Design a protein around this ligand. Structure first.
Ligand SMILES: CC(=O)c1ccc(N2C(=O)c3cccc(C)c3C2=O)cc1
Ligand SMILES: CC(=O)c1ccc(N2C(=O)c3cccc(C)c3C2=O)cc1
Ligand SMILES: O=c1ccn([C@H]2C[C@H](O)[C@@H](COP(=O)(O)O)O2)c(=O)[nH]1
Ligand SMILES: O=c1ccn([C@H]2C[C@H](O)[C@@H](COP(=O)(O)O)O2)c(=O)[nH]1
Lengths: 312, 312
């Protein structure tokens, strides 16, 4: 079944993973160099063994695809997955006057009443970002995240390049190019930036009218992140194929360090109990073609029948 | 045996490769997403099934490692593998006054007497680069090749960064970092530069005192280039491990497009006849540690017992 490589990766880290220390709990179990392949003609690789929220994946991807780095767009779609890094820039600031949190998130799991103050402050931040243009410009903007690296890469001349747009024009004109690459890794930013990109780079490839995509991901939370990551890049591959008038080929997912956190171990073990179901199918607006102006409604997922989410 | 993944890749492209057109003969047979793993504790993965010239690999790597882009250093080691791209910038120039070649190399294989004129002009160029400081500065310098991307990456402030040096300091201080990445792909240069890098990016990883390295290579000539490529990055991995006082782990070689040229087919087929021999062993200067000042003599290869070279 389509999603088995994901479950093999989880199991392989369980059986053959190497322990290492770090932060956010005791440490990790990891392997280096693993690869997962998904034949996108067999269905869409959204995990059936655990519910993965496709609406949050769709809206995050469309956000990148607009070259947008402001969480306001994501808030307008009820998508809060980028909030904390924005919240963090505001909390750590001089403009902020509420109950202090030197390290929320860590402390948010401990207290059942600091989690009360935090979730209110965060709710307030979310609202000011939604309705106050200047506050949003200042704190809603994450700066160097995927929308900018993909579509507005900052040059030495103080100019800006649309890598993804240029690659898509090349797919249409030079489909057999071996240079169809988008990188998110900028040696100039990477040593000071808040979040050096995990989704380091990707490459397209065309054969027999089918579009494939390989992602090199330097670092991967196998439990929390990888199931979202697989669905974002599979969707990316479908959308680019649609624009270019091609079929879909393979999505190949290649890792540097893929890891399980030492406290996510029983969660992934229970998921290994479950038996994949047949895969959903994706439907794209058949009469719209520029994916940089696609909206939520232009993307549909059919027949998705997941096991429950594992709140971990 | 250590080199079997190389031979499996060759065979897989023979059996399951997809034809595509291009240039420099009729076209290619290719696959996308293949991976090769080499356990460097089992020996050094220089191919035994075809002689690969380790001196040219050593000197090219030391050249990158000095951050040098001038072919003069390579000429001083009798290494001509970068010559033609330098020669090309001089031939295409206004300063040049000899018998013209709008497209040598292509025409060099045809004629058995234009190949005579070319090899003389090239011999002259080589000599002027060796002995004329100003000519060398102007034409010996390839500009944006690996030595500059690895060790002198050009920033927006008109400054320069030593990616590889900084990564090596991080391996020593933060060995479990998942950010040990060197990239050679610069979205600003890549659309005009002469040679967008094939060796797109690489990443280190440490576990149990062993250093591994994964290379993402966007495009690969399986017959001509890959056997040199495997030995450069394996050697790179050994040298970095030596500096840092670690053992060697795995070298993982990951491809975008790996291809066979439609006219190299019988050459690779004959190589598939041959039976790997036990692998050579590498010896490094046991009392020297900064690899950025290693020289030819500090690296030794023991017990290398190859089948003959296949002049193709
Ligand atoms: C600093 C760090 O380790 C870290 C960096 C990025 C994320 N991170 C996101 O921003 C993000 C957005 C949307 C989905 C997912 C699954 C993630 C995610 O995992 C999470 C942790
Ligand atoms: C333009 C192109 O296709 C092309 C780009 C780079 C190389 N190329 C080199 O510069 C080079 C230097 C040293 C060894 C090898 C095996 C290679 C190589 O294959 C060869 C061809
Ligand atoms: O899109 C993402 C972003 C992050 N991660 C996880 C993997 C790592 O646990 C962590 C990255 O932290 P560093 O490796 O950068 O230290 O986030 C993902 O799976 N997908
Ligand atoms: O270090 C190198 C450099 C090049 N190649 C081969 C692979 C491709 O045939 C060609 C690159 O041409 P493009 O893919 O950039 O068009 O060079 C290698 O194997 N190793």
């Amino acid at each position: 079944m389509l999603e088995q490589p994901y479950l093999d990766l989880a199991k392989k880290v369980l059986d053959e993973g190497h322990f290492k220390p770090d932060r956010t709990h005791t440490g990790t179990y990891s392997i280096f160099g693993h690869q997962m392949r998904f034949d996108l003609s067999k269905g869409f690789p959204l995990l059936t063994t655990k519910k993965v929220p496709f609406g949050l994946i769709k809206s995050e991807l469309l956000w990148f695809l607009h070259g947008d780095t402001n969480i306001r767009f994501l808030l307008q779609h009820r998508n809060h997955i980028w909030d904390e890094w924005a919240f963090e820039k505001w909390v750590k600031s001089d403009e902020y006057h509420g109950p202090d949190m030197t390290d929320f998130g860590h402390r948010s799991q401990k207290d059942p009443e600091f989690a009360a103050v935090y979730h209110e402050e965060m709710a307030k931040f979310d609202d000011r970002v939604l309705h106050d243009d200047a506050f949003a410009a200042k704190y809603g903007d994450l700066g160097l995240v995927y929308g900018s690296q993909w579509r507005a890469w900052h040059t030495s001349k103080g100019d800006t390049i649309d890598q993804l747009g240029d690659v898509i024009e090349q797919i249409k004109t030079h489909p057999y190019s071996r240079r169809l690459i988008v990188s998110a890794w900028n040696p100039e930013d990477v040593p000071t930036m808040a979040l050096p990109p995990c989704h380091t780079l990707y490459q397209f490839y065309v054969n027999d009218g089918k579009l494939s995509l390989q992602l090199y991901q330097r670092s991967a939370d196998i439990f929390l992140g990888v199931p979202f990551n697989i669905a974002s890049y599979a969707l990316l591959t479908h959308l680019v194929a649609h624009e270019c008038g091609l079929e879909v080929g393979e999505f190949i997912h290649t890792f540097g360090d893929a890891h399980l956190y030492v406290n996510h171990l029983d969660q992934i073990k229970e998921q290994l109990s479950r038996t994949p179901r047949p895969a959903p199918t994706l439907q794209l607006n058949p009469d719209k073609h520029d994916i940089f102006d696609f909206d939520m409604k232009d993307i549909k997922l059919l027949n998705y029948d997941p096991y429950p989410a594992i709140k971990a």
